[PDB]
Amino acid sequence: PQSFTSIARIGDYILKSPVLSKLCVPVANQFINLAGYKKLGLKFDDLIAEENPIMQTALRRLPEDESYARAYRIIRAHQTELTHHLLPRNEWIKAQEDVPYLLPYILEAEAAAKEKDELDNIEVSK
Amino acid sequence: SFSSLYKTFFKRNAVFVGTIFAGAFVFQTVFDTAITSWYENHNKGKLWKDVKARIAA
Amino acid sequence: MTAAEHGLHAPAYAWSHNGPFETFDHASIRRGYQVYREVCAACHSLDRVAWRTLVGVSHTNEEVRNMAEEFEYDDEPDEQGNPKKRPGKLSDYIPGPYPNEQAARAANQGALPPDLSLIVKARHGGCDYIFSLLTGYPDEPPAGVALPPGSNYNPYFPGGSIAMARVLFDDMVEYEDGTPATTSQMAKDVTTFLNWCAEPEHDERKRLGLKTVIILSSLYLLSIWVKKFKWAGIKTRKFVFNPPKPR
Amino acid sequence: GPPSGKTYMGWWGHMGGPKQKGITSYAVSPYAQKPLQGIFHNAVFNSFRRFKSQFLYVLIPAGIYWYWWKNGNEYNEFLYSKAGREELERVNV
Amino acid sequence: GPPSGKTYMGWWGHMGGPKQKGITSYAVSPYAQKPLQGIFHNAVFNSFRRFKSQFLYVLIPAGIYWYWWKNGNEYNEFLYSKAGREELERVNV
Amino acid sequence: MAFRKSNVYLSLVNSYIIDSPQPSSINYWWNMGSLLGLCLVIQIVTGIFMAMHYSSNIELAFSSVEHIMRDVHNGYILRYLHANGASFFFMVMFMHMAKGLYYGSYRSPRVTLWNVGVIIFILTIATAFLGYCCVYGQMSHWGATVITNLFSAIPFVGNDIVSWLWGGFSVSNPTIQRFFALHYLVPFIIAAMVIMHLMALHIHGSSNPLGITGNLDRIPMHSYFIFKDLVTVFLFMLILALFVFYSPNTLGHPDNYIPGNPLVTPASIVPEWYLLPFYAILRSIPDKLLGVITMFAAILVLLVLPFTDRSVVRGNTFKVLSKFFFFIFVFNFVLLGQIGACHVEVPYVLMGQIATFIYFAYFLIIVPVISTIENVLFYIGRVNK
Amino acid sequence: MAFRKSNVYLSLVNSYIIDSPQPSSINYWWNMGSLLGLCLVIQIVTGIFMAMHYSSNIELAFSSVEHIMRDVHNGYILRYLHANGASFFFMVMFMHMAKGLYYGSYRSPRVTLWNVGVIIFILTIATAFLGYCCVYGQMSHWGATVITNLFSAIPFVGNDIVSWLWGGFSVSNPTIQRFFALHYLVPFIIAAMVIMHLMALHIHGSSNPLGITGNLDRIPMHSYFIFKDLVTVFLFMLILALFVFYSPNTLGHPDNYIPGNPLVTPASIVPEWYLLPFYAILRSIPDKLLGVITMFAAILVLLVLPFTDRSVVRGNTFKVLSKFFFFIFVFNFVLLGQIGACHVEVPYVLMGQIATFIYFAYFLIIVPVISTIENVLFYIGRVNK
Numbered sequence A: 001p002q003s004f005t006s007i008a009r010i011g012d013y014i015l016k017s018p019v020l021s022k023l024c025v026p027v028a029n030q031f032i033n034l035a036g037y038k039k040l041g042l043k044f045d046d047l048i049a050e051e052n053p054i055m056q057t058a059l060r061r062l063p064e065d066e067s068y069a070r071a072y073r074i075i076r077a078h079q080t081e082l083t084h085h086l087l088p089r090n091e092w093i094k095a096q097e098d099v100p101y102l103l104p105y106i107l108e109a110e111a112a113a114k115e116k117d118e119l120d121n122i123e124v125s126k
Numbered sequence B: 001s002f003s004s005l006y007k008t009f010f011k012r013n014a015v016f017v018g019t020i021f022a023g024a025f026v027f028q029t030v031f032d033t034a035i036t037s038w039y040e041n042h043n044k045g046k047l048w049k050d051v052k053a054r055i056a057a
Numbered sequence C: 001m002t003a004a005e006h007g008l009h010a011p012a013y014a015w016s017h018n019g020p021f022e023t024f025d026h027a028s029i030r031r032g033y034q035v036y037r038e039v040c041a042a043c044h045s046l047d048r049v050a051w052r053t054l055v056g057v058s059h060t061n062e063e064v065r066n067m068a069e070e071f072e073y074d075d076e077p078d079e080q081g082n083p084k085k086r087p088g089k090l091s092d093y094i095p096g097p098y099p100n101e102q103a104a105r106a107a108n109q110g111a112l113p114p115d116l117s118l119i120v121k122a123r124h125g126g127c128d129y130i131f132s133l134l135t136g137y138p139d140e141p142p143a144g145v146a147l148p149p150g151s152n153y154n155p156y157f158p159g160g161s162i163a164m165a166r167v168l169f170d171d172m173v174e175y176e177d178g179t180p181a182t183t184s185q186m187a188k189d190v191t192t193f194l195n196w197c198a199e200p201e202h203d204e205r206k207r208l209g210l211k212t213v214i215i216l217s218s219l220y221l222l223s224i225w226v227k228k229f230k231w232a233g234i235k236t237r238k239f240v241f242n243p244p245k246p247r
Numbered sequence D, E: 001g002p003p004s005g006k007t008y009m010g011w012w013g014h015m016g017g018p019k020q021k022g023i024t025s026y027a028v029s030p031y032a033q034k035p036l037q038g039i040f041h042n043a044v045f046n047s048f049r050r051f052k053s054q055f056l057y058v059l060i061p062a063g064i065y066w067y068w069w070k071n072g073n074e075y076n077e078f079l080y081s082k083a084g085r086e087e088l089e090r091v092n093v
Numbered sequence F, G: 001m002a003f004r005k006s007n008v009y010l011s012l013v014n015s016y017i018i019d020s021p022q023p024s025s026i027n028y029w030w031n032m033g034s035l036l037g038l039c040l041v042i043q044i045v046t047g048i049f050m051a052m053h054y055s056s057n058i059e060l061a062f063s064s065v066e067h068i069m070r071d072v073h074n075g076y077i078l079r080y081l082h083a084n085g086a087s088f089f090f091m092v093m094f095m096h097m098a099k100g101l102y103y104g105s106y107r108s109p110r111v112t113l114w115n116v117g118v119i120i121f122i123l124t125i126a127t128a129f130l131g132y133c134c135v136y137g138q139m140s141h142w143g144a145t146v147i148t149n150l151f152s153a154i155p156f157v158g159n160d161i162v163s164w165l166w167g168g169f170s171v172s173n174p175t176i177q178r179f180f181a182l183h184y185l186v187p188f189i190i191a192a193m194v195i196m197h198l199m200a201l202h203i204h205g206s207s208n209p210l211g212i213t214g215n216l217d218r219i220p221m222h223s224y225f226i227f228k229d230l231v232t233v234f235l236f237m238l239i240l241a242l243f244v245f246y247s248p249n250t251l252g253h254p255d256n257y258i259p260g261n262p263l264v265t266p267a268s269i270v271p272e273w274y275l276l277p278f279y280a281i282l283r284s285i286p287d288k289l290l291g292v293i294t295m296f297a298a299i300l301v302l303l304v305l306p307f308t309d310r311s312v313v314r315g316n317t318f319k320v321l322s323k324f325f326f327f328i329f330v331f332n333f334v335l336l337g338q339i340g341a342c343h344v345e346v347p348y349v350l351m352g353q354i355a356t357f358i359y360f361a362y363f364l365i366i367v368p369v370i371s372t373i374e375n376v377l378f379y380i381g382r383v384n385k
Ligand code: HEC
Pocket: C035, C036, C039, C040, C041, C042, C043, C044, C108, C111, C112, C113, C114, C116, C119, C123, C130, C134, C157, C158, C161, C162, C163, C164, C167, C190
C-alpha cells in the first residue's frame, strides 16, 4: 500500500546523503540480519505481496530463469517452515546474493500505471 | 505371525470397526468399574456407607 | 477501597475436600446438619434443598421421613374449600423460619438473613470465608471503631460491622457420635454442610472428571502420534533444483 | 452456473502460481518411516533455538506491563492505608 | 472450486439446447404497446374456452366424492335417529 | 468423476473440507477457526438442551437455572459446559483475531473476510451479554442496567430507546424474556455469518506465516489438516474438561449466585472477564456519549487496519519493530482487561486512559509509521548507492 | 464484469434471483415456492415477536398467550397472523406438492429435489404440531396426548420413548417446555433445508407445464418473474389479511380457548385441519402399530413416486386418464380430511378405509397401470402397421 516509487524516493535521498547514510545504513543492515528471511533461503523480493496488478505484471515480465529460481526459493522456504527448522548455514542467502531483482520491473509497472491515471484525469487548457 | 494378525484383524474394515466397537464396549464397562473402585478406596471413611456402618455399629 | 472496606481475607484451611480426588466427609455433613437445625435454622433458610436429597448422603430414609413429618406444609383445600395442612413428605423443601421478608427484617433488627443454600458459592472465599466469619468474632472490636448499636464486629465481613452476633459457643450442641463439639468443630461441620447444600454434585463431578481427563489425555497423545504418522511424508520431503537450460 | 471474478487461487491443475521447471521432489511412505523420530533431540535443542530467537519480543513488553501493574497496585495499596492518607486526600480532593 | 457434474441446464450462452437456425423473433417495446389490450375479450371468450376444455376432469370426481359424502352423511343422520335405531344395533354389532 | 464431486451437497463438503488446497506452511495458529466451529456447535447444543428446562420469567429465571443444576440429570455438566465453553469460545476468538492481525490476514485480498469477521465478533459479544443477562444473578441484573443505561446518553431519542430496550422502566420481566428470545436468536445469525465467513475465505484461500504466496505447493485438507485439527480439538476438550469438572466457577463471578435484587447494588459491577477491556475503554472517558462512541470505535477500529498497514510484505514474521509493538499491543489489551475489573481509584483511571490511548494509537499511529520505517529500512539495507 | 457477478454474495443473489434463467412457459402455479418462502419469513418474524412475551410453563402458557392477545400492543395481530399464517403455509405447501405431482416435477433429473421437499414437509408438520401444543388449550393437550401416546405401540422400547418424550408420566410442564424449545428450533432447520432445496433446484432449473425441455427460450428472473411473483404476493397478503382481521378464528377450533385440563376429555379430539387426512389414515387401521406405520408410510409414499411413474412423457398436461385419476386423488385427500374431523361412527370408518386404500393405490397401482396404458395408446394411435 506504499508504492515502491515512494520507498525508492526516500531511500535514494537517504543513500545520497553523506551523514544520513553513515548513520542509517548500519541500522538497516542489522535490521536485515535480525529479520531472518535469509536463514530460510529467501531474497527480499520473494517477500513482497504479489496479489495486486502491479506485482502480477512485474512477475509476468520477470524472465524465465529468475522465475524458476524464485519458485524454488519459495517452495524451499515453505518446506523449511513446515519442519520448524532453518536451512543449514551454507544454504543461507548471503548479502551479495540478496539482490533487488524485481525492483526495476515493479518501478516500471508503477510508473506506467501512474502515467495511466494521470492521463485518464487529464485536463486541457482552453 | 504378524501376517496372520493382519489378515484376521486389520485386512477387512468390517472386522476392524467390529473389534473397535467390541473393545469400546468392554473398555467402557471395566474402565467405569476401575475408576469407581479407585475413587471409593481413595476416599475411605468419608463416603456414606462407611458412616452408615459406623452408626450401625 | 481500604482494607476494612474490603474485609480481611480468609486463610486457606485444609478442608477434607480440597483436592481433585477428594470427597465431602459425610459424617461432617451429618453433624453440620445437626448444627444447622439446632442453631442456624432460627434465622436462615434452606429454600433449595429438598428433603429427598439428604437420603443417602447424610441420613437414612426413615431418618429423613421423621424430620420431614415433624413439619407442616400447606395441603390442597378440602371438599368444602377450607385450607388444610399436612405433615411433610420427602418431596417437600426445607422450610424457613419466617413467612416473608418483612417478618425476617422485623425479627432481626432491620437486616435480612440470607438464605444459606448457595452461600459458599455466593461469597468470595467460599468455605474459608464461612468458617473464618463464624469463628472470627473478637471479644472486643479494635480500639477506635464506632460500632452502630445492634451490630457486631467481625473483620472478615466487608466493612466490619455485621448484624449477626456470635452464634457459636462451646458445647451448645451435643453430637450423637460423641465428638467434642466446640466452636471450631461446629463451624467446620456447618461449612461442610453448606458446601454440600451449594454443590450436591461434588463427588460425582470429581469422579467423572477423573474419567474424562484420563480418556482425553490418552486421546490427545494418541492423536499427536497419528498426526505425526500422517505428516511423515510431508515433513521428510526433499526438493532438488537443477536450473533448466535456457531456451 | 455463471463465472465469477478473477481470484488468486485456482484448483488442482490451475492454481495460478508461476510455471515450475527443474524442481524434483522425493518423499518416502510413512509406513516405511519412523514417526517420533528425533523428538528428544528437537525437544531440547530446537525448542531452545526457537525460544532464543523469539523471547525478547514477548518478554520485554510483558516486563514493562507487569512492572507498570505492580507499581500502580503498590501505589493504590499505599494510598488506601493509614500511612498514606494525606497524599490520598490531596490526590483526589 | 472444481467443476461439478454434467447438468441439463447451462447458463446464458451455453444453455445446452440444440443448435438453432432459421428462427427469427420479433418484439416491440412495452412502452410502445398497449397493456390490458384484449382483456374484455379474453375475459369472456378465452375463459370459456379454458373452462370448456378442463372442467369434466375436475367436476366428475368432485361430483363423485360429494355425492359419496352426502350419502354417508345422510346414512349417519338416519342411524342416530329415532326411526333408525333398530337398524343401528344390528349394524354396529 | 467421483461421487464426492458429482453431487450437489457433497460437492460443497468436498470443496470446503476434503479437497481444499491449504498452504503447507501453516502452523498451529490456523486451527483456531475449526476450534471456533467446534465451540459454536458446543454452545448451540448445550444451550438447546438447557432451554428445554429454562423458564424465562423474572421470578423463575434464577430458580430455573438451579433446577437445571440440581434436578436435571447431568445438568450441571450442561450449565458448566455452556458457561465455560462461552468463555473458551472467546479466548479462542481472541487468538483467531490476534493471529489475523499478526500475520497480516486482514490485507488486501481478504478485507471482506476481515469485515465479516468483525461482524461475527460484534454478534458474539451481543450473544454472550444477553446470555449472561438471562441467568439473572446480581452481576447479571446490574450489568444489564448499566449497559442499557449507556444508551440514555443519546441526546434526542435516548430515553425512548432505553425504554424500548427495557420493555418498561427498568430491567424486569419483559427485559428478561426479550433477552432470552434474542439470546437464542443471534447464534443462528452467527451461524449464517460463519457460512459467509467461509465463503469469503474460499475465493482466495488462507494465508501462511511467511506472507509469500502459497500457490506453489499445496496440500488437500483431508488426511493432513483434518488430523492436525484433531490434535487441537482433543487438547481443547482436555483443557475444557479440566475447567468444567475440577474448577467450574473459577472464571465466573461469585455474585451470580445471589438472586437479582433491584434494591441492593453489589458494590463492584463488572461484566464477564472477556468484556472487561471494552468496559475499561468505556470507563476511561469522562462522558457517557463519548464513552459509548469510544467503545464502539474501539471495536470498529479493526476496519481501519487494511488501510493503515503501509508495508509491502504481509505479516510480522520478518519485521522486528512490528513484532515488538504487536506484543506491546497484546499486553496493553491484557492490562486493559485487568483495569476493567478494578475500582475507579487513583492510579487506575490514568492507567486506563493511557492504555486506551495506546490501544487507539496502535491502529492509527503505530502501524503506519512502523510500516513506513520498515519499508525504507528493507530498501536501503540491501540496495547500494 | 458486473459487480453483481464479481462479488462473493452478490453473485449468489444474482445467480438465484436476478439472472436465473426460467422457462418462459411457466404459469402461476410456479409462484408457490416464492409464496412458501414469504410464508416462512412471516412465521419466523411473528414467532420471535411473540416469544419475546411468551412463557412456557404449564401454569403460564395459556395465560401468556392471552397476555399476548390482550395487553401487548398489536399482539392480536401477531397471534392471528402466526396462526392463520401457519394454516396458509400448509395450504400453499399442499398446492406446491400437488403441482409437483401433476406436472411430473418428481421425475428423473429432480428426484433429489423431490426428496428434500419431502423432508421439508415432514419438518413443517412437526413444527406446526409443536406450536399447536405450545398454546396449551384443551385441544392441544389432548392432541399431544393422543399423538405422543401412539408411540407406545412399539413392542420393546415404546414405553421408554414415550416417557422420554413426555419428560415425565403425562403431558406436563417438562413436555410443554420441551415442545417450546423444539418449536423454536425446527424452523431454522427448515430454512437450512430450504437452502438445500434451492441448491438442488439450481442444478437443473425449473420444469415447465409442457414437460418438454425449456433450454430453448428462457428469460431471466429479474423484472419478469419478480413482478409475476409480486402479483401473487399481494394476493396472498390480501387473503391472509381477510382471514386475520375479519375471521381470525374460523380456521381454528373453539376448544383451544378452554385452558388445558388433564381431567376433562373434550369428547371430540381433532388436530388442526391440515393434519386431518393423516389423522384419518391413522384412525382407519384397527391397530396401533400398524396405524402409526401407515401414517408414516402415507407421508413416505411420495418417495416411491419417481419409480412408479412408467411414462415417457413428463407431466399430466397431455394425458386424459392421468388427469382424471389425479383429480380423483385430490378429492380423495379432501374427503379424507373431512372424514378425519368426524366421529368414529358407522359409515365413516368404511369411508375412511376405502379412501385410505385409494390414497395408497394411487401411487402404487393406479399410476403405473394408467401410465403404461397411455404409453401404448400414444404409440398405436399414430404409428401404422
Ligand atoms: C439469628 C438472628 C441468626 C443465627 C442463629 C445465625 N445467623 Fe447468620 N445472619 C443473620 C443476619 C441477621 C445476617 C445478616 C447480617 C448482615 O449484615 O448481612 C446474617 C448473615 C450471615 C451470612 C452472610 C454474611 C455475608 O454476607 O458475608 C452467612 C454466611 C451466615 N449468616 C451464616 C450463618 C451460619 C452458617 C450460622 C450457623 C449457626 C448462622 N448464620 C447463624 C442471622 C443469624
